[PDB]
């Protein structure tokens, strides 16, 4: 996308979202990042939404095939390996964008927590399919990225901040689904929900809506886990 203007890539990424063309959206936002310039708050959302959709469809297809494989020629394993390899390529692509050079140039808490949360998410997606000599190192890479984002968010963001809430939500899912730490998952979601509850009185009606929506997602997981 080196020959297209930065503004045109952003413009076409928003059009791709409207058309539900998420692979195009990710390719447009990949080219926008590779222009070398930092991303605005809205542009960070476009990057996250694009790749979360692409990898989300890959994860759903991987789980369908892995379930058929476990119920059970080499066709099922070959095709699962095919989807798994393409999923790992997308995760590696996002992690490469964060490492070159989004994270090192993110100085504000809003941007740095956002990118480190992404880094934990896409290492978590790699962990969902890992079975070899790297599984433990991938899990620790996800934990380390989540933990740094947690440390900054607790120091620099109010308890009701949507990025802080979504970070704690996904980190709690990491504890439950990846790290085999359901008690850590329940404690984080509960502490996050309660501290956000006590901070709701400071918010406007629009910020109140933003925070309570994510707080309900934490409540949904707690109801499922307890």
């Amino acid at each position: 996308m080196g020959s297209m203007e930065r503004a045109s890539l952003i413009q076409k990424a928003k059009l791709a979202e409207q058309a539900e063309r998420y692979e195009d959206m990710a390719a447009f936002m990949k080219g926008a990042v590779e222009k070398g310039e930092e991303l605005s708050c809205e542009e960070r959302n476009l990057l996250s939404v694009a790749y979360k959709n692409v990898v989300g469809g890959q994860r759903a297809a991987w789980r369908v095939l892995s379930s058929i494989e476990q119920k059970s020629g080499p066709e099922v394993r070959e095709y699962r390996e095919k989807v798994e390899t393409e999923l790992q390529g997308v995760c590696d692509t996002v992690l490469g964008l964060l490492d070159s050079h989004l994270i090192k140039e993110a100085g504000d808490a809003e941007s740095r927590v956002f990118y480190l949360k992404m880094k934990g998410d896409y290492y978590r997606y790699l962990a969902e399919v890992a079975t070899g000599d790297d599984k433990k190192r991938i899990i620790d890479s996800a934990r380390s990225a989540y933990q740094e984002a947690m440390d900054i968010s607790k120091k620099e963001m109010p308890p009701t901040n949507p990025i802080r809430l979504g970070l704690a939500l996904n980190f709690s899912v990491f504890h439950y689904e990846i790290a085999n730490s359901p008690e850590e998952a329940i404690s984080l979601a509960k502490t996050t929900f309660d501290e956000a509850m006590a901070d709701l009185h400071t918010l406007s009606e629009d910020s109140y809506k933003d925070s309570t929506l994510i707080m309900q997602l934490l409540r949904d997981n707690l109801t499922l886990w307890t």
């Binding site: 998420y22 939404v49 959709n53 939500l169 996904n170 899912v173 997602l217 886990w225």
Partner: peptide, 8 residues
């Protein structure tokens, strides 16, 4: 266990 929903 639900993570942050992808799209909007």
């Amino acid at each position: 266990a639900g993570s942050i929903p992808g799209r909007r």
